[PDB]
Swiss-Prot record:
Annotated function: Morphologically, spectrin-like proteins appear to be related to spectrin, showing a flexible rod-like structure. They can bind actin but seem to differ in their calmodulin-binding activity. In nonerythroid tissues, spectrins, in association with some other proteins, may play an important role in membrane organization.
Family recorded in the similarity comment: Belongs to the spectrin family.
Location relative to the cell: Cytoplasm, Cytoskeleton; Cytoplasm, Cell cortex
Domain SH3 intervals: 1-58
Residues of the full protein shown: 968 to 1025 of 2477
Name of the coding gene: SPTAN1
Organism annotation: Gallus gallus
Name the UniProt record assigns to this protein: Spectrin alpha chain, non-erythrocytic 1
Subunit structure as annotated in this protein's UniProt entry: Like erythrocyte spectrin, the spectrin-like proteins are capable of forming dimers which can further associate to tetramers. Interacts with ACP1.
Length: 58
């Protein structure tokens, strides 16, 4: 569908654009385009997460 990632480590936002996510989470990755702050659909929000702490499922 979109892209998906397995969360390798947790993360907690530092900004309204960033969102929190938890280690193990199958996130729905929305924009890998940014390279570094990848945008994903997570919980209820289309927010930024560190590209570091995620691994492409697809």
């Amino acid at each position: 569908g979109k892209e998906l990632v397995l969360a390798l480590y947790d993360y907690q936002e530092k900004s309204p654009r960033e969102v929190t996510m938890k280690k193990g989470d199958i996130l729905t990755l929305l924009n890998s385009t940014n390279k570094d702050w990848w945008k994903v659909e997570v919980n209820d929000r289309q927010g930024f997460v560190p590209a570091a702490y995620v691994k492409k499922l697809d």
